[PDB]
Design an enzyme around this catalytic site. Structure first.
Site, mmCIF file in Angstrom:
data_model
loop_
_atom_site.group_PDB
_atom_site.id
_atom_site.type_symbol
_atom_site.label_atom_id
_atom_site.label_comp_id
_atom_site.label_asym_id
_atom_site.label_seq_id
_atom_site.Cartn_x
_atom_site.Cartn_y
_atom_site.Cartn_z
ATOM 1 N N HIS A 81 0.802 -1.224 0.000
ATOM 2 C CA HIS A 81 0.000 0.000 0.000
ATOM 3 C C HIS A 81 0.831 1.267 0.000
ATOM 4 O O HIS A 81 0.373 2.327 -0.473
ATOM 5 C CB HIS A 81 -1.039 0.000 1.123
ATOM 6 C CG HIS A 81 -0.527 0.497 2.457
ATOM 7 N ND1 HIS A 81 -0.194 -0.333 3.459
ATOM 8 C CD2 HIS A 81 -0.339 1.797 2.942
ATOM 9 C CE1 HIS A 81 0.199 0.390 4.533
ATOM 10 N NE2 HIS A 81 0.115 1.694 4.211
ATOM 11 N N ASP A 116 -0.530 -7.354 1.817
ATOM 12 C CA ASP A 116 0.129 -6.043 1.917
ATOM 13 C C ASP A 116 1.648 -6.191 2.100
ATOM 14 O O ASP A 116 2.177 -6.003 3.201
ATOM 15 C CB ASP A 116 -0.458 -5.217 3.062
ATOM 16 C CG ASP A 116 -0.062 -3.756 2.988
ATOM 17 O OD1 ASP A 116 0.497 -3.356 1.946
ATOM 18 O OD2 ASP A 116 -0.308 -3.006 3.958
ATOM 19 N N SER A 149 4.030 2.778 8.615
ATOM 20 C CA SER A 149 3.614 1.712 7.681
ATOM 21 C C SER A 149 4.777 1.271 6.816
ATOM 22 O O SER A 149 5.588 2.104 6.433
ATOM 23 C CB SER A 149 2.466 2.170 6.769
ATOM 24 O OG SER A 149 1.316 2.517 7.516
ATOM 25 N N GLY A 150 4.834 -0.020 6.492
ATOM 26 C CA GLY A 150 5.948 -0.580 5.715
ATOM 27 C C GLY A 150 7.159 -0.965 6.577
ATOM 28 O O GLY A 150 8.026 -1.737 6.136
HETATM 29 C C1 LIG Z 1 -8.898 0.850 8.915
HETATM 30 C C2 LIG Z 1 -7.721 1.365 8.097
HETATM 31 C C3 LIG Z 1 -8.076 1.458 6.608
HETATM 32 O O1 LIG Z 1 -8.496 2.501 6.145
HETATM 33 N N1 LIG Z 1 -7.939 0.353 5.846
HETATM 34 C C4 LIG Z 1 -8.240 0.354 4.402
HETATM 35 C C5 LIG Z 1 -9.044 -0.868 4.035
HETATM 36 O O2 LIG Z 1 -8.405 -2.071 4.459
HETATM 37 C C6 LIG Z 1 -8.274 -2.067 5.872
HETATM 38 C C7 LIG Z 1 -7.407 -0.928 6.339
HETATM 39 N N2 LIG Z 1 -7.230 2.666 8.580
HETATM 40 C C8 LIG Z 1 -8.107 3.743 9.085
HETATM 41 C C9 LIG Z 1 -7.212 4.971 9.034
HETATM 42 C C10 LIG Z 1 -5.835 4.364 9.330
HETATM 43 N N3 LIG Z 1 -4.703 5.156 8.846
HETATM 44 S S1 LIG Z 1 -3.512 5.576 9.868
HETATM 45 O O3 LIG Z 1 -2.698 6.526 9.163
HETATM 46 O O4 LIG Z 1 -4.149 5.955 11.098
HETATM 47 C C11 LIG Z 1 -2.536 4.142 10.180
HETATM 48 C C12 LIG Z 1 -2.272 3.758 11.425
HETATM 49 C C13 LIG Z 1 -1.640 2.498 11.843
HETATM 50 C C14 LIG Z 1 -1.750 2.081 13.172
HETATM 51 C C15 LIG Z 1 -1.160 0.906 13.614
HETATM 52 C C16 LIG Z 1 -0.460 0.127 12.718
HETATM 53 CL CL1 LIG Z 1 0.283 -1.355 13.269
HETATM 54 C C17 LIG Z 1 -0.331 0.497 11.393
HETATM 55 C C18 LIG Z 1 -0.917 1.680 10.963
HETATM 56 C C19 LIG Z 1 -5.919 2.975 8.703
HETATM 57 O O5 LIG Z 1 -4.987 2.259 8.385
#
Ligand SMILES: C[C@@H](C(=O)N1CCOCC1)N1CC[C@H](NS(=O)(=O)/C=C/c2ccc(Cl)cc2)C1=O
Ligand SMILES: [Ca+2]
Ligand SMILES: [Mg+2]
Lengths: 53, 234
Positions: free
Chosen positions: B42, B88, B185-186
Site C-alpha cells: 500500500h 500487503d 507503515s511498511g
Molecule cells: C482501517 C484502516 C483502513 O483505512 N484500511 C483500508 C481498508 O483495508 C483495511 C485498512 N485505517 C483507518 C485509518 C488508518 N490510517 S492511519 O494513518 O491511522 C494508520 C495507522 C496504523 C496504526 C497501527 C499500525 Cl500497526 C499500522 C498503521 C488505517 O490504516
C-alpha cells in the site's frame, strides 16, 4: 515438552525434529558450529545483530 | 510510534525510510540484504518517485552514517488489494548495494514453522519508525522503537470493524497508550530470540492509533517466506 518444545532443543536458532531427534540450523550468513547447536557468523555485520563499536 | 523510546546508537540498524521528492519520509522498510528492502504494498501508492534512506536516527542532524539509495525494481504482491489490505507486502531491489556499518545492518529471515511455533508465541515483538507520535500529531524527527505484545487472534477479530485475513496478525494494547501510527507503515516488526532479531511482521494498518479496544495490524511475514525468497532471486 519434548525435543524442540523443550527449551528450543538447546539450539541457538532454528530447531526441527527428524525421526525422534532434534536437528539445529542457522539463518543465512551463519554456519552451524562443531557441536551442531551454536550458530557462528561467517562475516562482518551478520543479520539480526545490533551494531557495536 | 505512539509512546515507546528512542532507538539508541546501533539498536535499530535494519530500519529503512522511504522518502519523497521533498526529502520527507512517508513509510518505513526493513533491510533484508545489501540489495533488498521489505515494505508494504500500500505504501507504493503514496508517491510518484521515491528513494530509500538508511543509517539515520535524527532527521535534523548529520550523524555520519546516513546513505540514500535509488530503487531499481519494485516487486509488489500481485494479489494485494486496497479494499482489505490483504497481501500487503512488497520487496524493493536497490540500484547500488548497501554498505553495512554502525546503524546499518540486516534483520534475519526466519523459517516458517519455527517462527510460528517459537517466535510468534513469545510475549512481545518490537516495532519501529519515524511516524506520528500521536494520532493527530506531527512525524517524529527521531527514530523510535516500542515493545508490542502479541495479541490473541480471536480477541483481535472480535475488536475489529474490518476483516482480519489469514495474511495478518495483531499486536499492541487494549487501552495502554502505545502503538505504531501513520508514517510507520511498511516498517519492521521484529522478534528477539537469544540476542538475535528476526523479521516477523510489516507495519500495515489500524483504526486510528492507540485507541481503546483497538490493536495494530501487521502483515504476517511467515506466510510470505517462499514469496520473499523468489522475489530476492529475480
Ligand atoms: C482501517 C484502516 C483502513 O483505512 N484500511 C483500508 C481498508 O483495508 C483495511 C485498512 N485505517 C483507518 C485509518 C488508518 N490510517 S492511519 O494513518 O491511522 C494508520 C495507522 C496504523 C496504526 C497501527 C499500525 Cl500497526 C499500522 C498503521 C488505517 O490504516
Ligand atoms: Ca541524521
Ligand atoms: Mg488499543
Amino acid at each position: 515438552r519434548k525435543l524442540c518444545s523443550l527449551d528450543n532443543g538447546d539450539c541457538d536458532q532454528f530447531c526441527h525434529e527428524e525421526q525422534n531427534s532434534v536437528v539445529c540450523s542457522c539463518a543465512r550468513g551463519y554456519t552451524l558450529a562443531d557441536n551442531g547447536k551454536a550458530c557462528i557468523p561467517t562475516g562482518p555485520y551478520p543479520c539480526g545483530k545490533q551494531t557495536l563499536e | 510510534i505512539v509512546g515507546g523510546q528512542e532507538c539508541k546508537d546501533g539498536e535499530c540498524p535494519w530500519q529503512a525510510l522511504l522518502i519523497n521528492e521533498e526529502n520527507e519520509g512517508f513509510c518505513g522498510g526493513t533491510i533484508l540484504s545489501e540489495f533488498y528492502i521489505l515494505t508494504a504494498a500500500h505504501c507504493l501508492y503514496q508517491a510518484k518517485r521515491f528513494k530509500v534512506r538508511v543509517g539515520d536516527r535524527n532527521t535534523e542532524q548529520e550523524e555520519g552514517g546516513e546513505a540514500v539509495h535509488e530503487v531499481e525494481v519494485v516487486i509488489k504482491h500481485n494479489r494485494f488489494t486496497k479494499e482489505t489490505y490483504d497481501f500487503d507486502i512488497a520487496v524493493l531491489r536497490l540500484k547500488t548495494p548497501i554498505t553495512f556499518r554502525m546503524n546499518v545492518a540486516p534483520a534475519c529471515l526466519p523459517e516458517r514453522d519455527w517462527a510460528e511455533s517459537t517466535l510468534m508465541t513469545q510475549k512481545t515483538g518490537i516495532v519501529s519508525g519515524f511516524g506520528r507520535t500521536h494520532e493527530k500529531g506531527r512525524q517524529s524527527t527521531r527514530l523510535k522503537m516500542l515493545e508490542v505484545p502479541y495479541v490473541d487472534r480471536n480477541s483481535c477479530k472480535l475488536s475489529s470493524s474490518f476483516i482480519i485475513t489469514q495474511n495478518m496478525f495483531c499486536a499492541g494494547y487494549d487501552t495502554k497508550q502505545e502503538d505504531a501510527c501513520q508514517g510507520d507503515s511498511g516498517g519492521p516488526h521484529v522478534t528477539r530470540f537469544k540476542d538475535t532479531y528476526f523479521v516477523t511482521g510489516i507495519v500495515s494498518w489500524g483504526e486510528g492509533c492507540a485507541r481503546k479496544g483497538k490493536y495494530g495490524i501487521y502483515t504476517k511475514v511467515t506466510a510470505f517466506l517462499k514469496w520473499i525468497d523468489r522475489s530476492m532471486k529475480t
